[PDB]
Amino acid sequence: DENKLIAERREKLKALRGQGIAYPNDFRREDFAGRLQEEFADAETWTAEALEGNGRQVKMAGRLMAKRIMGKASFAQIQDESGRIQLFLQGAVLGDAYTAFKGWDVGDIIAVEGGLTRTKTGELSVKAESIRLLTKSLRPLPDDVEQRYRQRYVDLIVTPESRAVFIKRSKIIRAMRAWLDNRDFLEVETPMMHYIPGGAAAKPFTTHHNALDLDLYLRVAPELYLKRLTVGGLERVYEINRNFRNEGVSTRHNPEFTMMELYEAYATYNEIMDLTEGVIRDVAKAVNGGTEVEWDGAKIDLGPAFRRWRMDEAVRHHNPEISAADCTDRDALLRHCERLKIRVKPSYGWGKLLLEIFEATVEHTLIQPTFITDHPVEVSPLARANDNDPGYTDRFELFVNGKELANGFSELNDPEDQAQRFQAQVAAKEGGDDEAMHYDADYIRALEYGMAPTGGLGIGVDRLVMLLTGSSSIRDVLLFPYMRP
Amino acid sequence: DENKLIAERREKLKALRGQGIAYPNDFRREDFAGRLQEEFADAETWTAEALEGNGRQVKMAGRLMAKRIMGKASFAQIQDESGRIQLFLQGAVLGDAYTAFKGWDVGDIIAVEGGLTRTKTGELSVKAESIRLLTKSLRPLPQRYRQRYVDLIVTPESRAVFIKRSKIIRAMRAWLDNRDFLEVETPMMHYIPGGAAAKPFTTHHNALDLDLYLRVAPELYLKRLTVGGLERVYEINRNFRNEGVSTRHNPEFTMMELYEAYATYNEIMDLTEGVIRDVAKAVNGGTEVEWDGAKIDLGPAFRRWRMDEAVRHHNPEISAADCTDRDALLRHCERLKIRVKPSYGWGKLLLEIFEATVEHTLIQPTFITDHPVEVSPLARANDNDPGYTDRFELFVNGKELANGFSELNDPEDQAQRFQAQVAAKEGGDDEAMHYDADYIRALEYGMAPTGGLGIGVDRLVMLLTGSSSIRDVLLFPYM
Ligand SMILES: N[C@@H](CCCC[NH3+])C(=O)O
Numbered sequence: 001d002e003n004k005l006i007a008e009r010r011e012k013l014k015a016l017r018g019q020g021i022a023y024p025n026d027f028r029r030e031d032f033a034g035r036l037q038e039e040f041a042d043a044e045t046w047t048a049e050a051l052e053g054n055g056r057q058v059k060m061a062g063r064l065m066a067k068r069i070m071g072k073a074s075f076a077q078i079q080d081e082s083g084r085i086q087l088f089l090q091g092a093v094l095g096d097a098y099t100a101f102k103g104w105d106v107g108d109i110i111a112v113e114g115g116l117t118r119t120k121t122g123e124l125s126v127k128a129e130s131i132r133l134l135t136k137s138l139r140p141l142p143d144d145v146e147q148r149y150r151q152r153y154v155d156l157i158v159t160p161e162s163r164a165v166f167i168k169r170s171k172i173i174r175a176m177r178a179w180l181d182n183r184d185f186l187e188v189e190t191p192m193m194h195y196i197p198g199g200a201a202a203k204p205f206t207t208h209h210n211a212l213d214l215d216l217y218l219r220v221a222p223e224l225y226l227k228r229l230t231v232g233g234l235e236r237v238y239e240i241n242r243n244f245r246n247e248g249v250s251t252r253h254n255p256e257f258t259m260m261e262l263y264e265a266y267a268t269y270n271e272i273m274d275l276t277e278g279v280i281r282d283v284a285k286a287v288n289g290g291t292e293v294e295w296d297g298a299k300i301d302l303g304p305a306f307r308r309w310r311m312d313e314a315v316r317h318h319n320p321e322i323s324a325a326d327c328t329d330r331d332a333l334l335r336h337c338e339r340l341k342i343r344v345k346p347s348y349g350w351g352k353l354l355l356e357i358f359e360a361t362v363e364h365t366l367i368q369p370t371f372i373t374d375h376p377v378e379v380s381p382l383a384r385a386n387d388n389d390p391g392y393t394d395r396f397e398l399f400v401n402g403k404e405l406a407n408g409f410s411e412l413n414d415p416e417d418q419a420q421r422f423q424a425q426v427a428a429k430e431g432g433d434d435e436a437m438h439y440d441a442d443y444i445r446a447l448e449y450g451m452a453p454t455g456g457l458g459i460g461v462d463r464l465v466m467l468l469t470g471s472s473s474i475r476d477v478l479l480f481p482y483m484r485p
Numbered sequence: 486d487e488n489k490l491i492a493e494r495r496e497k498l499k500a501l502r503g504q505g506i507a508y509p510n511d512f513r514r515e516d517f518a519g520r521l522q523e524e525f526a527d528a529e530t531w532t533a534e535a536l537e538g539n540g541r542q543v544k545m546a547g548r549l550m551a552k553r554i555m556g557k558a559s560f561a562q563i564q565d566e567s568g569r570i571q572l573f574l575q576g577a578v579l580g581d582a583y584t585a586f587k588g589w590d591v592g593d594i595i596a597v598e599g600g601l602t603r604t605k606t607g608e609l610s611v612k613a614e615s616i617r618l619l620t621k622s623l624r625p626l627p628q629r630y631r632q633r634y635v636d637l638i639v640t641p642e643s644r645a646v647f648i649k650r651s652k653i654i655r656a657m658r659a660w661l662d663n664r665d666f667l668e669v670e671t672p673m674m675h676y677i678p679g680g681a682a683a684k685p686f687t688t689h690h691n692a693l694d695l696d697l698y699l700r701v702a703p704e705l706y707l708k709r710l711t712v713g714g715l716e717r718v719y720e721i722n723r724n725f726r727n728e729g730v731s732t733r734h735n736p737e738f739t740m741m742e743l744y745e746a747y748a749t750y751n752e753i754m755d756l757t758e759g760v761i762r763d764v765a766k767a768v769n770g771g772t773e774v775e776w777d778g779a780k781i782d783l784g785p786a787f788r789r790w791r792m793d794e795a796v797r798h799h800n801p802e803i804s805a806a807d808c809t810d811r812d813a814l815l816r817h818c819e820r821l822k823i824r825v826k827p828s829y830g831w832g833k834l835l836l837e838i839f840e841a842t843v844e845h846t847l848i849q850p851t852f853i854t855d856h857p858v859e860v861s862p863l864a865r866a867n868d869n870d871p872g873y874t875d876r877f878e879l880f881v882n883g884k885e886l887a888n889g890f891s892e893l894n895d896p897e898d899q900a901q902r903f904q905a906q907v908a909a910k911e912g913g914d915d916e917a918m919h920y921d922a923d924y925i926r927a928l929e930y931g932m933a934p935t936g937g938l939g940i941g942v943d944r945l946v947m948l949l950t951g952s953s954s955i956r957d958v959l960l961f962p963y964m
């Protein structure tokens with residue numbers, strides 16, 4: 001079937017090469033289908049007689065999506081990047097080019113010039129004075145669900161409503177940059193290859209620089225490089241770019257993902273939360289015109305102030321059998337974990353156990369936007385310890401519809417404290433932990449030069465785009481998501 | 486003697502921890518030194534009496550850069566992200582905080598509040614009414630690339646380069662967005678490395694048991710978007726080259742790539758010189774720049790010069806017939822002492838002669854056009870002489886700044902060029918491209934005729950900031 005159609009289109013191309021240049025590049029496109037549809041949307045004012053009288057001429061090109069051959073005259077529909085428009089073709093006007101049109105195929109790229117009119121059913125149409133083939137298609141367009149991702153180039157053609165998700169993705173990132181730029185944050189670029197993978201607990205990709213005989217790591221986060229800039233005196237910086245994770249086969253998580261990270265000297269996690277909900281809410285209003293969105297069935301409103309809820313309080317609310325004393329009591333939390341069927345390791349302190357209970361019993365219930373605050377120090381190796389209870393850190397994670405969207409904290413700038421935590425992570429990696437951090441001596445050295453007290457932030461841009469576009473799957477907001485071979 | 490200095494500072498930190506929270510984070514910085522200097526630059530209006538009388542109070546923090554103790558009174562200088570300002574400290578006003586200040590070290594991060602004044606020497610100064618230590622420094626200030634975090638401190642002039650770099654990229658995005666190009670993100674890991682002749686980094690996805698390549702270019706993914714009908718796209722992001730040891734080159738570098746359906750290299754050259762010129766005006770206020778001792782004017786229309794004519798101008802021994810005669814070009818190469826390879830056809834030999842005798846003479850902005858097909862595997866062949874392609878490279882001050890062409894959209898031609906590349910990759914060419922059957926498939930669905938472009942962002946920033954080394958426009962260059 002399909003292999004027969006392809007051969008037939010190659011025979012058409014073979015005859016095309018004998019008549020001349022089969023792939024010409026000398027057509028200047030000037031007009032866009034969607035801009036014309038908007039300009040002439042009022043069919044009461046722009047009747048067929050009005051459009052023909054106006055004398056407007058257009059010069060367009062697009063992919064041939066449909067043909068209606070009536071005999072001496074035909075209709076066609078083309079699609080460019082902005083939308084679709086009808087064409088009206090008359091053999092008495094177009095002559096040999098009308099004969100050519102009858103032989104073209106859906107998928108061919110054609111160019112057309114002419115005036116405007118409106119069909120009997122109200123559709124804006126080009127009255128074609130001249131028409132020509134620019135690119136012969138050799139593969140017919142489709143009339144599995146994984147082919148939309150292994151062939152994004154096909155799906156953008158036949159599901160053109162998906163284009164709007166990617167356009168909005170671009171507007172979201174641009175709105176975020178304007179919001180930050182207007183607040184005098186400096187956008188910076190830091191390396192994507194690191195000597196030591198740091199700044200997140202994730203398994204990295206490794207690569208090799210052959211000339212230097214040097215192993216390198218694709219970054220899991222830019223955090224430790226960005227705080228070196230804070231030390232240097234770039235006191236308000238951000239970066240929006242890729243991180244890399246070398247983890248399990250997942251349909252919900254891509255090995256490449258886009259994060260915005262930001263560092264503001266002299267802020268705490270209180271001000272960083274303010275900033276986080278401010279930029280998310282304002283970007284939502286800029287690209288959607290309001291603060292409400294429907295995501296995965298949930299009706300989310302970003303307008304009201306986000307909730308701020310301690311992790312231990314949220315755990316106790318959802319686990320009434322846990323007392324306030326139990327929250328820092330490792331033996332009590334083991335009992336609850338066993339009771340909740342939560343697999344535990346012997347290296348887990350009370351803080352890790354509390355996080356496990358939070359993940360199993362709390363986080364799926366956080367639908368409306370909620371900052372969960374004050375994470376235990378055991379699970380927060382880069383966050384500043386709280387002044388009043390050093391078993392906790394001044395940290396937060398933002399959840400929307402049960403999903404983590406951002407995380408930030410008052411930054412640990414005490415080099416001796418940071419070195420100690422680095423050493424506990426090196427001890428944790430020896431116990432079979434593939435995600436424990438490494439000791440980065442050069443970063444300790446930067447902190448020894450002195451870093452201002454600072455607040456830092458990461459926003460998951462892909463999940464932010466999923467939320468604001470109402471996309472349930474990561475694969476709908478990435479142009480080329482990774483697919484298994 | 487530095488390790489003893491570190492020990493003394495650590496002892497000071499120990500005493501600090503004994504007195505309270507040594508690393509506090511409860512200071513809300515409100516004012517910036519560089520903005521106060523601008524606001525009060527007019528010392529005729531803003532005498533000491535007018536500053537002290539206006540009642541302005543500031544609240545700022547910065548790194549302690551200098552101290553001058555004069556008994557009961559002292560001067561100090563601090564530096565934040567915006568510049569430097571002087572502090573005036575009186576023991577009669579600050580009490581115990583003055584005693585603490587005399588113990589502080591250059592490099593410490595401190596916070597201060599007070600009014601403003603001006604010294605006898607005309608310097609804007611904060612009359613400190615309250616001062617406190619936020620971060621004790623443990624390492625004395627003295628590198629430039631091994632410790633950018635030190636050089637940004639003591640060479641604050643370098644900050645302006647990186648600020649201007651961010652403004653250049655921002656102005657480029659605005660110029661392209663205002664012309665309805667869509668900024669996209671394509672993968673940085675590829676199944677097949679393509680889009681440039683460069684040795685790639687390889688990595689491995691463990692769970693999928695699959696080898697991947699860090700991209701040398703996004704080109705083949707961007708053109709798949711053209712096929713999909715995203716007809717005006719651009720991307721500004723990293724490429725990765727696993728090349729040899731070089732101080733002039735960095736294994737990571739930033740490129741802007743753009744694809745415009747229904748353009749040729751003529752219109753892409755128009756676009757290229759327009760965006761460069763307009764971005765220069767936006768960040769520099771004009772079109773002239775001094776770069777590595779050369780005075781460059783981006784204002785006039787860029788020269789457009791064929792490669793073969795430029796070669797013959799600088800090598801008059803080379804005839805018109807010679808330019809497509811492999812044996813004649815081999816003789817010229819030997820006479821010019823250019824080392825070459827037996828697999829080089831006339832087109833590659835012409836490029837080698839261009840690189841050796843022409844490229845370094847191209848000071849004022851010059852598009853060199855019409856590259857041989859042998860060295861242009863993704864460029865559309867010329868309709869009248871298919872030994873050449875409709876391609877250009879932009880040179881300024883002897884350096885390549887951009888490259889673009891009318892795009893090859895003929896899938897059968899593209900597959901043949903890939904097949905020649907594969908034969909070379911088996912002949913000992915680590916930079917020969919691979920066959921990408923999925924890209925060919927996308928072209929078989931049909932791509933509009935298209936023009937494409939790559940601009941070297943790092944070199945553009947070097948040009949527009951007058952920086953002679955790429956290490957001066959990269960925050961963390963590879964060392
Ligand atoms: N590095 C963090 C984001 C910033 C956290 C605050 N310093 C992450 O990967 O999620």
Ligand SMILES: N[C@@H](CCCC[NH3+])C(=O)O
Nearest residue numbers: 681702704889937938939
């Ligand atoms: N991929 C090219 C830039 C685009 C050329 C036009 N398709 C490069 O790496 O230089």
Ligand SMILES: [Cl-]
Nearest residue numbers: 017020021022
């Ligand atoms: Cl042809």
Ligand SMILES: [Cl-]
Nearest residue numbers: 502505506507
């Ligand atoms: Cl302390």
